[PDB]
Amino acid sequence: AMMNQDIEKVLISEEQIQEKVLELGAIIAEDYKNTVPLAIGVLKGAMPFMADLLKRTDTYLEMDFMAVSSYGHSTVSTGEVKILKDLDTSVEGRDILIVEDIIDSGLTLSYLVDLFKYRKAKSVKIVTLLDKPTGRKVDLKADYVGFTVPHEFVVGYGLDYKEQYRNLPYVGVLKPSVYSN
Amino acid sequence: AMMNQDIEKVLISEEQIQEKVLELGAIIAEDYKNTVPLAIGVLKGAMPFMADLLKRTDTYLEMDFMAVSSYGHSTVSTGEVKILKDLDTSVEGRDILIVEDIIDSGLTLSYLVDLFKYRKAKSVKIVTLLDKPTGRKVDLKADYVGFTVPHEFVVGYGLDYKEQYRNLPYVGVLKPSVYSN
Amino acid sequence: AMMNQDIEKVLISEEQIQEKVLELGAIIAEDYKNTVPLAIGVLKGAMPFMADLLKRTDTYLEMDFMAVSSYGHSTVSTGEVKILKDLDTSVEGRDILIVEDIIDSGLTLSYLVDLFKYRKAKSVKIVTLLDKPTGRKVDLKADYVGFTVPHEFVVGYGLDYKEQYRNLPYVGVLKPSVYS
Amino acid sequence: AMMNQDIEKVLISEEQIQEKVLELGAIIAEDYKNTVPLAIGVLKGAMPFMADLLKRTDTYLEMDFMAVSSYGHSTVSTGEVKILKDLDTSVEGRDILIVEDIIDSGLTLSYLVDLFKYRKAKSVKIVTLLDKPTGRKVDLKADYVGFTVPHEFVVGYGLDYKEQYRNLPYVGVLKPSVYS
């Protein structure tokens, strides 16, 4: 109730998230019943969603994580990013499931998707909590989507504003007074 | 593919975890009243606990993550580990909170604690879900402890056996038959 | 105990190496006269050759380095490796010159070449000091080659055996008694 | 358009460097004859000096490298840096020799030195080609030094301006027109 002061609107409630997580986890568990997928999230934003989704995914799976950084101009036009932490294990022959917080332009995510394909993954799919198709600067459709949202000015449940608000249990929109700081 | 069938005992149930998470989160929010701490998790095991704990910690805070790997013999004796992913931001002058899944020998965690102190952190504290004090090979006491356990043969809620079972919503103990595989 | 006592014979002497780096540097300086290329070395073995080669290439260029680790089976069969140190700058649109100590199997090197192509490099070329065509496990030809050699268990000038001998100023054949 | 056009003066010729490098190699070879040291370079500037120095050090040794990034304020005030590539092996008990191109403020080098001590290195020593001891922002004395130099804006032999000039075989003073 302390950080809710700064939230103008609760876009996706905790109750909604946990309901959708249960639905998606069961779907994913059924689709991957015949393989042991490698579920990977990109730090930092996807961590809260990845924790909830996977522990409601009742099937055998492995986890891993990547960390990336922007190259600046090149990242905004092509999605190319600097690998700060590569996967612990090889991608070849694995069924990859990328767990993402939001897809807006989709440039960086497309860059990583096709990188894993270059590394000869058996398959690559995406489950994203939020989808903003309005902002696509490349053709990328997620295979599982939690909620479609109109804009990217969202915080909470992993999403930050200047590294804060990631620890909200829901997705919200900040009061404009926050952007003045 | 219900994973419960491999579990011999639910050591710490999901209900217990969420109960303890609410307790700790409120204690931590009060203790870090007058600062913006940097909450740090070491991949991979602390990810589910860090997600739950921080979203029940009603205060301003920043998140970050580290990745480390064993050097072999040296890691088992001194706790020295290879840094694969360093913190995104500097440690100097920050109040560091390390979120851990379990403390057993405590060597690697003690190595990281005194590394942050070498990097001139203002303070360094530890919250761990599980504590196995009978395994200490070094003097190290966590400042926040979820539960005390007798041994380290546990899986679930981030903890793995051969990279599996991290996605259980609870902490359990495997049937011996799975050790035979 | 000295390192030369472990060398059976010299394959390429220091003098011959410096003659070759002088030749290669002049060619590279000519081919890259109208661009600022990104000369990339993969640690650790390419470091001695990359140092000597580039200070004999009288032209504007920039350096960078990558560090990688093996994934085990995938690395030995497809060349896929774990990136520990990615380039400090974006590959898009750059003329990449990979500086290599030796091309034997060529798997990992080919993986990195087509990785830079996936990252939309303007061009990707390789200069290697040594070339063992007999070792290939993938089709890969260097653009600049110092020496083509038959199979010998060589060390020196960046090439190691168990992390030692990299600091020899020449390339020598290791005594079989060392690597039984 | 050639690089020497941008050089106002040659501060340390290639001949001078190699004579001193030869001299440093023999001292280090003697001092470390009874141990296998871990020679560490921090990318990228130390690479040309490290290559020449180590191939003039006739003794058994291993090489490794570290890659670091600046954190901004903390780096220029305490030397704390972001580890991108850590060492490939444990520091505990090793005799560490850090090969450096130049020590000016010494902040980051001092941070890494005491990091290796915290990691229980048996010994940590430094060999630098150049030393500006008047630029120190921390008490740091190099164990081996090539040339002691006043305050100049130098490039070459690993030292860059905006990632260029690293491949000069000599150390030169950059024309003021260039960097302005």
Author numbering:
A (entry chain C), B (entry chain A): 0 to 180
C (entry chain D), D (entry chain B): 0 to 179
Provide passages from the article that reported this PDB entry.
HPRT is a purine salvage enzyme that converts purine bases and PRPP to GMP and IMP, which are precursors of the essential nucleotide GTP. HPRT activity was previously found to be inhibited by (p)ppGpp in several bacteria including Bacillus subtilis. To examine the molecular determinants underlying (p)ppGpp regulation of HPRT, we turned to Hpt-1 from the pathogenic bacterium B. anthracis, which pppGpp competitively inhibits similarly to B. subtilis HPRT. We crystallized Hpt-1 with and without ppGpp, and for comparison, we also crystallized Hpt-1 with its two substrates, PRPP and the non-reactive guanine analog 9-deazaguanine.
Crosslinked apo HPRT was resolved by SDS–PAGE as bands corresponding to monomers, dimers, trimers, or tetramers (lane 2).
